[PDB]
Amino acid sequence: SYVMPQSFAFVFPGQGSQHLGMLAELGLQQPIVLETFQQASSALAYDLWALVQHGPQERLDQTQFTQPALLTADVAIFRCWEALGGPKPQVMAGHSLGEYAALVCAGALKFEEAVKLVEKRGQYMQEAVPVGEGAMGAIIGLNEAEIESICENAALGQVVQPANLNSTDQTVISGHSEAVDRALNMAKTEGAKIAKRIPVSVPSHCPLMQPAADRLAQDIAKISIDSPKVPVIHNVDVVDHNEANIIRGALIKQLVRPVRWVETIKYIEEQGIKVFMECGPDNKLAGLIKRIDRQSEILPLTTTELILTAIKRLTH
């Protein structure tokens, strides 16, 4: 008899969630995975599946490859969810690059257009800061206020600021490499449990990305955007938007402003949604969400069995 399904959100991972061989199992099980990668490959003009399966590692980890790889992986998983009978989520959110996946899956952006766009996003971001001059760092155990103060004191004329607000006591900072190091050292001085560089060159979500944002804005103006059919909560402002130019603004501003992930998760939970499906490879967002709320449930979707389990959970 009738069972009201649990409300749920899809969360789409970004950078950091890529790995060689990702989706290999799902790719054997579900023809739509290879078809999706074929679509992406036609847009990119190289065999993306081959790159993701065989690498090399260093290749996959370069931004211009990571971005289309992860967008494609996230969309492939969404398509498998739908193919296996999964219903629409009540809301979607993606972490940085993941926001593009959310917009593709919400029907706002055409997949192959988005693939090309995120390749450009990666290319432009890579080029924004000369090699070695930027950095990102993870700080665990201090709150945002404490970290903001640290960044202000460490900057000394350079850029360093909160970049990803990931969980309540987990923040990534971004900026000039020297300033990031100064800030991380101050964070340790102030009692951070961890204050460490992350292995990226590109200082995303800070004003050093402005040159990339300017370039991407030109491309984004040319891409057709439809109103999302499922609300997508944007990183930059923690709200959904229906209007194309407002979505464009949100995507461009995203590059230079922090990813407000903890506020996004809190917003979703305040709406009564405590079941999250991680629509992509790896379990990085589950890690964050569980820290934000230990009572939340985050379900992986990386195999047919996991997808079917997740679908069943909605009514059981």
Side-chain angles (χ1 to χ4, degrees):
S1 60
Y2 172 66
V3 170
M4 165 122 90
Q6 189 87 11
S7 307
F8 67 104
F10 268 32
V11 296
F12 295 84
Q15 182 138 9
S17 295
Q18 78 286 354
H19 51 91
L20 291 180
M22 63 178 193
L23 284 63
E25 181 171 0
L26 196 66
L28 292 169
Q29 296 179 148
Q30 298 300 333
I32 198 55
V33 174
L34 287 173
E35 183 80 323
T36 299
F37 275 81
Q38 280 166 351
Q39 288 169 3
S41 294
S42 292
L44 293 161
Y46 63 89
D47 185 342
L48 183 59
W49 182 249
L51 186 158
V52 169
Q53 297 311 307
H54 303 298
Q57 180 69 55
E58 65 207 303
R59 203 107 281 119
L60 179 58
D61 286 340
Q62 290 178 328
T63 80
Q64 66 174 331
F65 299 105
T66 309
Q67 296 196 32
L70 280 173
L71 171 67
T72 301
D74 286 3
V75 168
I77 289 168
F78 181 81
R79 288 177 173 182
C80 288
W81 172 266
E82 293 209 310
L84 288 162
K88 300 288 190 183
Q90 280 59 70
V91 65
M92 295 178 180
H95 191 294
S96 190
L97 175 56
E99 183 154 309
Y100 291 81
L103 289 166
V104 169
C105 295
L109 299 178
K110 183 171 179 150
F111 175 55
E112 292 130 27
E113 296 180 1
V115 168
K116 295 185 179 170
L117 183 62
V118 302
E119 179 182 49
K120 284 166 180 176
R121 180 179 185 270
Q123 290 173 339
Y124 300 159
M125 289 177 348
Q126 180 74 255
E127 295 184 15
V129 176
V131 58
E133 294 188 7
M136 301 189 81
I139 299 174
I140 300 187
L142 297 178
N143 62 52
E144 192 191 333
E146 283 168 322
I147 292 164
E148 288 175 346
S149 178
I150 286 166
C151 289
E152 290 173 2
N153 292 338
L156 298 169
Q158 294 190 291
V159 174
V160 55
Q161 53 195 70
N164 295 343
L165 308 179
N166 281 344
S167 91
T168 354
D169 74 336
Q170 180 175 326
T171 297
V172 179
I173 65 169
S174 188
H176 289 110
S177 51
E178 299 91 350
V180 166
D181 285 343
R182 290 190 301 274
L184 293 173
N185 201 58
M186 288 188 192
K188 270 285 192 190
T189 307
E190 296 295 303
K193 296 187 163 152
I194 293 291
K196 196 161 205 186
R197 290 268 280 260
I198 301 171
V200 296
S201 61
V202 176
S204 56
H205 304 298
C206 80
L208 298 181
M209 287 300 99
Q210 189 64 49
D214 292 345
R215 294 172 76 188
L216 196 64
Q218 298 182 318
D219 295 309
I220 283 176
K222 294 175 194 279
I223 185 171
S224 297
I225 304 177
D226 288 343
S227 282
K229 295 191 182 317
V230 171
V232 172
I233 305 307
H234 290 272
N235 289 345
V236 67
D237 56 9
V238 202
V239 300
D240 59 311
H241 296 302
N242 295 140
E243 311 93 336
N245 283 326
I246 304 304
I247 294 169
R248 292 187 174 93
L251 293 170
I252 295 305
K253 194 177 182 177
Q254 189 206 49
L255 294 162
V256 295
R257 289 298 266 252
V259 173
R260 297 163 69 181
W261 192 250
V262 52
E263 285 165 284
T264 296
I265 298 305
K266 285 180 173 196
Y267 181 108
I268 291 167
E269 290 206 311
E270 284 171 8
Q271 296 301 316
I273 298 165
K274 300 200 169 32
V275 175
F276 296 82
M277 272 69 173
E278 183 151 15
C279 195
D282 211 346
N283 64 2
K284 297 286 194 276
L285 300 180
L288 300 180
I289 294 167
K290 199 59 107 151
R291 292 194 163 112
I292 294 162
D293 176 13
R294 195 61 54 173
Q295 301 310 134
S296 64
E297 179 170 12
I298 311 96
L299 298 158
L301 296 180
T302 48
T303 71
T304 296
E305 186 156 54
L306 289 170
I307 290 167
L308 291 168
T309 293
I311 296 171
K312 190 175 187 183
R313 190 264 173 263
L314 292 177
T315 55
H316 285 87

